[PDB]
Amino acid sequence: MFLFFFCDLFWLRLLLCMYYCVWSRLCFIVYFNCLMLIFDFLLFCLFDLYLFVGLCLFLLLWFMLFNLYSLILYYCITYLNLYLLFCIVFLLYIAFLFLFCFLCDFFLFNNLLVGDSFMDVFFIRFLLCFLECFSLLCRCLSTFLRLFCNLLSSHFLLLMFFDFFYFIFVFFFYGVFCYWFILFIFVFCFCLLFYVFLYLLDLFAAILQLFIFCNMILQLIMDFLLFLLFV
Amino acid sequence: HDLPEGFEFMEHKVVNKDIHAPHENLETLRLTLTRQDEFLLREEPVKCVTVTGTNGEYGIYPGHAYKIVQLNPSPLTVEYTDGTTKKYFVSGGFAHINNEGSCDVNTVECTLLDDLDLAIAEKELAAQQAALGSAKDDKAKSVVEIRISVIEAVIAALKHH
Amino acid sequence: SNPADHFRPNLKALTLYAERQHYVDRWLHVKERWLAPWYLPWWSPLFQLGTWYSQRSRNLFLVENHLSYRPYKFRRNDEDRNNPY
Amino acid sequence: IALAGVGLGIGTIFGNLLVACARQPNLTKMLFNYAILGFALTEAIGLFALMLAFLMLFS
Amino acid sequence: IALAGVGLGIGTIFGNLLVACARQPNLTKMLFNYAILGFALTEAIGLFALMLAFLMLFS
Amino acid sequence: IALAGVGLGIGTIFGNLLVACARQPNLTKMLFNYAILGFALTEAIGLFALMLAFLMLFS
Amino acid sequence: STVAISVQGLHYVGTGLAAIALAGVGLGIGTIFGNLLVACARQPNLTKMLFNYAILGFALTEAIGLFALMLAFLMLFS
Amino acid sequence: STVAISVQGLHYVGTGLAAIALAGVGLGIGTIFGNLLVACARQPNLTKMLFNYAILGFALTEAIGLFALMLAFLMLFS
Amino acid sequence: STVAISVQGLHYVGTGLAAIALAGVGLGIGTIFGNLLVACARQPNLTKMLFNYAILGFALTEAIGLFALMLAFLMLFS
Amino acid sequence: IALAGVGLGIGTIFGNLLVACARQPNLTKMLFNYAILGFALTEAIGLFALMLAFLMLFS
Amino acid sequence: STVAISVQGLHYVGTGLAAIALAGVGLGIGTIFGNLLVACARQPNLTKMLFNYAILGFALTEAIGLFALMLAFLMLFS
Amino acid sequence: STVAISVQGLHYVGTGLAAIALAGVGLGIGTIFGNLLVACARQPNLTKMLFNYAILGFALTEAIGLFALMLAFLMLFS
Ligand SMILES: CCCCCCCCCCCCCCCCCC(=O)OC[C@H](COP(=O)([O-])OCC(O)COP(=O)([O-])OC[C@@H](COC(=O)CCCCCCCCCCCCCCCCC)OC(=O)CCCCCCCCCCCCCCCCC)OC(=O)CCCCCCCCCCCCCCCCC
Numbered sequence A: 001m002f003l004f005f006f007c008d009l010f011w012l013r014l015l016l017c018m019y020y021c022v023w024s025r026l027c028f029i030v031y032f033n034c035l036m037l038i039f040d041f042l043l044f045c046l047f048d049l050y051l052f053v054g055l056c057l058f059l060l061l062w063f064m065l066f067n068l069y070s071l072i073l074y075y076c077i078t079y080l081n082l083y084l085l086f087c088i089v090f091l092l093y094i095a096f097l098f099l100f101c102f103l104c105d106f107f108l109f110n111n112l113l114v115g116d117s118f119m120d121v122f123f124i125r126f127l128l129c130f131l132e133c134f135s136l137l138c139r140c141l142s143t144f145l146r147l148f149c150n151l152l153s154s155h156f157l158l159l160m161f162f163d164f165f166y167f168i169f170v171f172f173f174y175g176v177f178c179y180w181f182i183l184f185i186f187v188f189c190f191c192l193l194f195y196v197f198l199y200l201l202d203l204f205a206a207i208l209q210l211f212i213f214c215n216m217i218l219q220l221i222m223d224f225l226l227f228l229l230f231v
Numbered sequence B: 001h002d003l004p005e006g007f008e009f010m011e012h013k014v015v016n017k018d019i020h021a022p023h024e025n026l027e028t029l030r031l032t033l034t035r036q037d038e039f040l041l042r043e044e045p046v047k048c049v050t051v052t053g054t055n056g057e058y059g060i061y062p063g064h065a066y067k068i069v070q071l072n073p074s075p076l077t078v079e080y081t082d083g084t085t086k087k088y089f090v091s092g093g094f095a096h097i098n099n100e101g102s103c104d105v106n107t108v109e110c111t112l113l114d115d116l117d118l119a120i121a122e123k124e125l126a127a128q129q130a131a132l133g134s135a136k137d138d139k140a141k142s143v144v145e146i147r148i149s150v151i152e153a154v155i156a157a158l159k160h161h
Numbered sequence C: 001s002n003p004a005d006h007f008r009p010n011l012k013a014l015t016l017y018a019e020r021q022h023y024v025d026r027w028l029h030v031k032e033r034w035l036a037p038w039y040l041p042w043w044s045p046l047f048q049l050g051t052w053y054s055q056r057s058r059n060l061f062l063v064e065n066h067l068s069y070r071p072y073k074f075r076r077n078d079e080d081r082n083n084p085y
Numbered sequence D, E, F, J: 001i002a003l004a005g006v007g008l009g010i011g012t013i014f015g016n017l018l019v020a021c022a023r024q025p026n027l028t029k030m031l032f033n034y035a036i037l038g039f040a041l042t043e044a045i046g047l048f049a050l051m052l053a054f055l056m057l058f059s
Numbered sequence G, H, I, K, L: 001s002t003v004a005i006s007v008q009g010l011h012y013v014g015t016g017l018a019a020i021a022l023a024g025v026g027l028g029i030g031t032i033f034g035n036l037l038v039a040c041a042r043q044p045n046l047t048k049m050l051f052n053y054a055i056l057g058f059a060l061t062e063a064i065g066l067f068a069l070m071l072a073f074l075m076l077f078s
C-alpha cells in the first residue's frame, strides 16, 4: 500500500520563498540554550557539542509552521500520529546515543552505576544502574508521548468548545430580543472570555512544548559531555 | 610579637553543651541582659523570659533549644521563680538562647517600662505623623515610619498594663 | 467520534497497491541484472553486500520450526481476533 | 477506611509533640497530657466506625 | 468515611496546639479553650455523617 | 464524604489560629473573628453537601 | 443480541460523586484562612489588603465549587 | 453466545467522577492564595507582582479544571 | 454456559476515572506557584529566573495530566 | 486501605522525631519513647482493621 | 450450575483506575519543583546543581507513571 | 439454587486498583527529592551523603512499587 498525499505547508513554503530570498537577522530563538552550553569560561569540549544547533533550528521551524498555525480553523497537522512522532524522536535520540556509543569509551558509562562504594553493589547499585538504563529509553518515550498528547488534547478541547459556541450562538441568539436577554448576554460574554483564554493558552503551550522537546534532546547530550579546563 | 585578643580578658565564657551527652532537667534559666556593653542582670536565675522577636513572641523556659532571635522594638518580660515580674522595653538587638540553660539578650537600649511616659509618646507620634506628609523623599518617609512604629509599640506596651 | 475524525490528513490524492511477492521478485530481478556482469566478481564487497544478508535472512526463515501458527501476512481479513484464517 | 484518618491524625499529634518537646523540654509533662487528650478524642471517633462495622458485619 | 476527615482534623488542631504551647506556654489556658472550640465544631460535623450512617442503617 | 474535607478544613483554621495567637496574643480578637468567618464559609459548603444527601435520602 | 436498559436510580450515584468535589473546595477555603491569620500575625498593618485577597481566593475557589454543584443538581432532577 | 447490552444511566456515573477532578483544582487554587498572603506578609512591597503570578497560577489550574469539565458535560450529553 | 457479552456504557466510567488524575496535576501546579511566591518574597532579585523554572515545572507536571486525558478521549471515542 | 492511613502516620511520627533529635539531640530518649508509644497506638488501630479484614475474609 | 460470562467492556474501568495513579506522579513533581524554587532563593549560587537533582527526581518519578501508563495500553488494546 | 459464575473481565479492575498504589510511591519520591533540595541549600557541604540517602529511600519506594506491579501483572495474566 502506497498513499500519495501532501503536507499542509505549501502556502507557508510560498511565503518562505517570497520573504527569505533576501537575508534577515534572527535574534529570537525558541530554544536558545542549544547555542550556549558552557557558562564558565576557560572550559572547552573536544566533543562536537554544537552539532545539535542546526537540527534544533530546523525542528523548531518545522514544528512551529505546523503547530502554531494549527490554531487557525481547518488547518491540519499532517504529522499528528503517535508512531510518526516516535520515529522522529527515535531518529534524534538514538542517533546521539549511538554517537556517544561509537566513541568506544566505556568509562563514559561509569556514572550509570549510581552511588558510592559504601552501598552494596549487587542489591543497590546494580539495581539503580538497571533503573537508569531503563530511564534513558523512558525519557525518549516520554518526550514523544508528551509532544503528541499536548496537541491532541488541546485541539480536542478547542473543537468541542467551538461546537458549543456555534450551537448557542446560532440557535439561541434570538433571546436578545426576548425577556431573558441578560442570561444570553452573560453566557455569550463567558464564551468570548473562554475563547480568548483557550487561544492564549494554546499559543503559550505550543511554544513551551517545543522548548521542552528540544531540552530533552540537549539533556541527553549534556549527560555525557566532559569539559576540560584551559591551562 | 603577638598581640592579644580582647576576648582573652573576659573569663565569663559561653558554656555549650555537647551533642552526645545526657539530658538534665533545669528549674532556672541564667539570663544575661545587656545594654551598650553594660549588663543589668548577671547570669540571674529566672523562671522564664518573654521576648518579642521579628516573627513573633517567644517564651523562653529552661532547656530551650539553641536559637538566635532578632529582636524588634518591644517589651521584654522576666518572671522569677519567686513569682515576681520585671518588665523592660527594648529598641532592638539580639537574643541568643543556649540549650545549656542560658539566655543572653544584648540590646542597643533596654529601659524600664516605668521610665517611659504616655503623653510624651502621644505628642511625638503626632509630630511624626505631621512630618510624614512633609517627608523630603522616600528615605525620610521610611525613617518616620520606623519612628512611628516604635512609638506605637511603646504606647501599646504602656496601655496593656 | 466526530471530533476524532478531524485529525486526518486533508490532502490524500492517490493510493496504489502492490503484492509483496510481485515487487520483491522485481527487485530481485533488478539486483540480478546489476550483479550479473563479469566485471563484478563474487568476492567483491558490493556483491556480498547485495546477496549475503538476504541469503542469511531467507535461511533463517527456512530453518524456522515454531510450535505456534503465524497467520498469513496478507489475509483478506486480519481484524478478527478469533479467526487466524 | 475511617481508621485511615484516625490513625494518621494520631500520628500527626505525636509528630508535633516531639517538635514541641524538643523546643521546650521543661513542659513535656503538660504537652504529653494534651497529646493523650487528643488521642482520647480521635480514638473515640474510631469507636463509632468500629461500632458501625460490628453493627453491619453482624447483621 | 467522613469521619476520616474529622478525626484527622482534630489531630491537626492539637498538633498545632502543642507547637503553640511550646512557644507561649503562659497562654495555654487561653489556647486550650480555642482548641476545644475547634473540636466542638469538627465533632458537630461528624455527627451529621453519623446521623446519616444511622438513618440508612435503620431504614 | 464531602464533609471529610470540610471538617478537616475547619481544623486547619483552628490549627493556624493557635500558632497565630502565640506569635501575636494582642490580636486574638481579630484572628478569632477571621477564624469564625472561615468556619462559616466552610460550613456553607458542608450544608450544600448535607442538602444533597438529605434530598437523595428522602426521595 | 441488543438489550437497551434504562436504570433510573443511577442518576443518584453520579450526583453524590459531584458532591465529593466540594471537599476539595471546602478544605481549599480553610487553607486560605489557615494562612491569612498567620500573615495578619506576621504583618498586622496589612490586615485589610490580605483580607481582600483571601476573599478573592474564596471567590475563585467558591466559583469552582458552584460549577461542580451545577452537575450535582442537574443529574438529581434528570 | 453473543449478547450485547447498552445501559443508559452510566453517563451519570462517569460525569460525577470527572467532577471529582475539581476537588484538587479547588484545593490547589486555595493553596496558591494561602502562600500569596504569607509572601505579601514577608515582602509587603511586592503586592502586585505576587498578585500577577497568583492570577497566572489560577488561570493554569482553571484550565485543567476546564479540561475535566468538558468531559463532565460531554458524557452528560452523550 | 458461555456468553460473549458486550456492554456499551462502561466506556463512560473509565473515562471519568481518568479525569481524577487531573485532581493531582491541578493541585501539583498550585503547589509550585505557592512555593514560587514564598521564593520571590525571600529573594526577589531572582524573580525572573524563578518564574522560568516554575514554567518548566508547570509544563512537566501538566504533561502528565494530558496522558490521562488522552486515555479518556480514547475510551470516550471508542 | 485503612493501613494506608496507618503507615503514613507512622512515617510522619518518625519524620518529626528526626527533626526533634536534630533540634534537641540530648533529648533523644524521651522522644524515642514517645514515638514508640505513638507507633503502638497507631498499630493498635491497624490491628483492629486487620481484625475486621480477617473476620470478613473467613466469613 | 457452571456459567461462564465474558464481559468485553470492563477493560475501560481498569484503564481508568491505572490512569488515576498519575495524580500522585503529578503531585510529586509539583512538590519537587516547589522545593526547588524555595531552595534556590536560599542558596542562589548553587542553583544549577539543585536543578540537576530536581531533573533526576523527575526522571525517577515520571518513570513510575509510565509503568501505570503501560498497563493502561496493555488493557486498553486488549 | 446454586450458581457458579465465572466472569472473565474482572482481572482488569484488580490490575488497575493495584496500579493505583503507585500514586503513593511517586509522591514519596517527590517528597524525598524536595527535602533533598531543601537540605542541600541548607548544608551544601554534605551533598554527596544526602544524595546517597535519598537514593536509598528511592530504592525502597521502588521496591514497594515493584511489589505492586508484580501483583498487577499476576492478576492481568492469571
Ligand atoms: C499512475 C498515476 C500517476 C502516479 C504514478 C506514481 C508511481 C509511484 C511508484 C511507486 C512509489 C511507491 C512509494 C510511494 C511513497 C509515497 C509517499 C508520499 O507521498 O509521502 C508524502 C510526501 C509528502 O511530501 P511533502 O511534504 O508534500 O513535499 C513534497 C512535495 O513534492 C513538495 O516538496 P518540495 O516543495 O520541497 O519539493 C521541491 C520542489 C521545490 O519547489 C518547486 O520546485 C515548486 C514546484 C513544486 C512542484 C511539486 C509539488 C506538486 C504539487 C501537486 C501537483 C501539482 C500539479 C500537477 C498537475 C497534474 C495534472 C494532471 O521542487 C520540485 O518539486 C521539483 C520538481 C519541479 C517540477 C517542475 C516542472 C516544470 C515543467 C514545465 C514544462 C513547460 C513546458 C512548456 C512547453 C511549451 C511548448 C510550446 O511525499 C514525498 O515526500 C514525495 C513522495 C514521492 C515518492 C516517489 C514517487 C515516484 C515518482 C512518481 C512520479 C510520477 C510522474 C508521472 C505523473 C504524470 C501525471 C499523471
Ligand SMILES: CCCCCCCCCCCCCCCCCC(=O)OC[C@H](COP(=O)([O-])OCC[N+](C)(C)C)OC(=O)CCCCCCCCCCCCCCCCC
Pocket: A015, A016, A019, A068, A069, A071, A072, A073, A162, A166, A199
Ligand atoms: C506571536 C503571537 C502571534 C499572535 C497573533 C494573534 C492574532 C489575533 C487575531 C485576531 C482575530 C482574527 C480574526 C480573523 C478572521 C478571519 C476570517 C474568518 O472568518 O475567520 C474565522 C476563523 C474561525 O472562526 P470561527 O470558528 O468562529 O468560524 C465559524 C465558521 N463556522 C461556523 C463555519 C465553523 O477565525 C480563526 O480561526 C482565527 C484564529 C486566529 C488565532 C491566532 C493564530 C496565530 C498563528 C498564525 C499566525 C499567522 C502569521 C503569518 C505571517 C506570515 C508568516 C511568514
